[PDB]
Amino acid sequence: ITAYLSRIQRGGYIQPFGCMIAVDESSFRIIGYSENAREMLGIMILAMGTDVRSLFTSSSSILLERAFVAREITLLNPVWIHSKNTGKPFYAILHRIDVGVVIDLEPARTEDPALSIAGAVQSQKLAVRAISQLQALPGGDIKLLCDTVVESVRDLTGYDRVMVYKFHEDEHGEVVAESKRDDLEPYIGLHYPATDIPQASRFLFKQNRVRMIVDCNATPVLVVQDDRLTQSMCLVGSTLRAPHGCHSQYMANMGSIASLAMAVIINGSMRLWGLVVCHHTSSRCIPFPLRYACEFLMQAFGLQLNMELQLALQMSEKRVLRTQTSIMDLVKCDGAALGVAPSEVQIKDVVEWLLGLSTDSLYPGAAALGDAVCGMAVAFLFWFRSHTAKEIKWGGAKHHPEDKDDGQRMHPRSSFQAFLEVVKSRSQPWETAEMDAIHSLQLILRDS
């Protein structure tokens, strides 16, 4: 039913910057492994049914033995594991799927433990501090929140470009705030079609809230599984999951070799309001502690943003109902029949034509008298409403409302160059609550 779903969830390819080993929870037998595992572990004795504890040191062995039995595996991540052959350190990110226990081995850049530990502690500390700074911001100012959070996230991660990508009502997105590198060109203010980010990706982002991609140009690695498995494994929770081909070529064409997307969650029962994407001109990999730290920071961001939204909304409605009982500051309309509205001529003509009504695009005759008068509300009072922003700067493509997603499509667009668009002469779409208030007010005026 959902496009790209099974292809992202159970796509038998992982990123080549690390290796992955899928184990049977009850028998500790290997039921899956990526082809780069043998090379990365320096095995040059790894097959289907090989005891995992034989691949690593005995301490690591009994440690992961403790890990499998545990009520919650996530609490032991990451497991610092040494290899039998090489002796090089690996971060072990364990999680559970419907088949067994998946182990994500990510090579550790620092070899001496003290420096790595100090780095992790430093990262967590920087996350706590970033959140603390994020808490002291004045309320109501969401733009300041997003700017300070892209500056913070950029300061922590070190990516050349960091930005907040807001999902609008019609599922089309918009970079609302960014902290790019100075010499890089601004992607801020741009708009993108809804098909750039499929519903499947947004759903999986609601479930999995942090996704790292080290290199789009890097050749994906096929993970071979035991022939006894009914279907291809669920590599959603895997931090090494290779991106879909279309998004790989997408990142390739956009100039983002290394990506990192985090979810922005509110509620309406959770809802994905937007993302915070990070693009790097070159390829880079950040360790697990930094990633989890960023997930925490993004959790705080999601909470605070949710608060701001709720409070601003209820306060807005409260302000409407309070101003109801200054006439001009009642609704968002520019004209009220006084205000952004012509003389009694166009009024006479419109009234002449009128003999519950509301439109967002104004009746060709008197609609060319002014660019302001485009929205009409009739119920005896008349409401004029100004037209929307007549220019939208898209990033290579326009969001077509009747355009949907299909799993067979596996090739993106060629360029994301900013191009302007003149939307049809329309006013801002009249809300339903506004019309209900118009009815209530109509009854009120009918009484007296």
Binding-site positions: 246
Count of residues that bind ligand O6E according to CB under 6 A: 29
Identify residues 40-59 at the interface with a copy of itself (CB under 8 A): 59
From the list 229, 300, 372, 418, which residue makes contact with a copy of itself (rule: CB under 8 A)? 300
Structure tokens belonging to residue 440: 């209530």
CA 201 to chain centre: 9
Distance CA 355, CA 353 (A): 6
Choosing among a copy of itself, ligand O6E, none, which partner's interface includes residue 244 (Cβ < 5 to 8 Å by kind)? ligand O6E
Can you tell me which of 159, 250, 273, 430 binds ligand O6E, judged by CB under 6 A?
A: 250
Does 4 bind ligand O6E (CB under 6 A)? Our answer is: yes
Q: Closest separation between CB of residue 11 and ligand O6E, Å?
A: 7
Residue 53 or residue 398: which is nearer to ligand O6E going by CB? 398
Residue 39 CA to residue 56 CA, distance in Å, equals 14
Question: Could you say which of 400, 404, 409, 439 contacts ligand O6E (CB under 6 A)?
Answer: 409
When asked if residue 187 is in the footprint of ligand O6E (CB under 6 A), the reply is yes
User: Taking CB positions, which residue lies at the least distance from ligand O6E?
Assistant: 246
161 part of the interface to ligand O6E, by CB under 6 A: no
Among 92, 63, 57, 59, residue whose Cα is nearest residue 77 = 92
203 near a copy of itself, rule: CB under 8 A: no
Restricted to residues 258-297, the positions that interact with ligand O6E (CB under 6 A) are: 259, 261, 275, 277
Place of tokens 């008298």: 369
Q: Which is nearer to ligand O6E, 31 or 197 (CB)?
A: 197
Q: Using CB under 8 A, which of 33, 91, 165, 383 touches a copy of itself?
A: 91
Is residue 120 involved in binding ligand O6E (CB under 6 A)? no
Phi (first) and psi of residue 276, to 5 degrees? -125, 95
C-alpha closest to that of 202 among 2, 52, 414, 442? 2
Say if CB 394 and CB 406 are below 8 A apart. no
Instruction: Please say which residue, 127 or 275, places its beta carbon nearer to a copy of itself.
Output: 127
At residue 38, φ and ψ (nearest 5 deg) are -60, -40
Closest CA relative to residue 55, chosen from 26, 22, 99, 25: 22
**Which CB, 134 or 435, lies closer to a copy of itself?**
134
Half-sphere exposure of 409 (CA within 13 A, CB side): 12
Chain position carrying tokens 């071979």: 224
Q: Which is nearer to a copy of itself, 134 or 347 (CB)?
A: 134
Looking at 78, 173, 198, 395, which residue binds a copy of itself (CB under 8 A)?
Answer: 78
* CA distances from residue 134 to 146, 203, 365, 432 in whole angstroms, order as listed: 10, 27, 53, 35
CA distance 298 to 265: 9
Closest to 251 in 3D by CA, of 215, 304, 211: 215
Decide which of ligand O6E, a copy of itself, none touches 90; Cβ closer than 5 to 8 Å per partner kind.
none
Helix (H) or strand (E) holding 165: strand 161-167
H-type alpha helices, 3-57: 5-9, 37-40
Distances (CA, A) of 420 to 166, 191, 291, 402: 19, 10, 36, 21
Return the residue matching tokens 């290779």: 242
The annotated binding site for phytochromobilin is made up of 246
> Could you say whether residue 192 binds ligand O6E (CB under 6 A)?
yes
Binding site for ligand O6E (CB under 6 A): 4, 8, 165, 173, 175, 187, 192, 195-198, 201, 211, 213, 243-244, 246-247, 250, 254, 256, 259, 261, 275, 277, 409-412
Binding site for a copy of itself (CB under 8 A): 59-60, 63, 74-81, 91, 112-118, 120-129, 131-132, 134-139, 265, 267, 269-270, 288-289, 292-293, 295-296, 299-300, 302-304, 306-307, 310-311, 314-315, 317-318, 321-322, 324-325, 444, 447-448
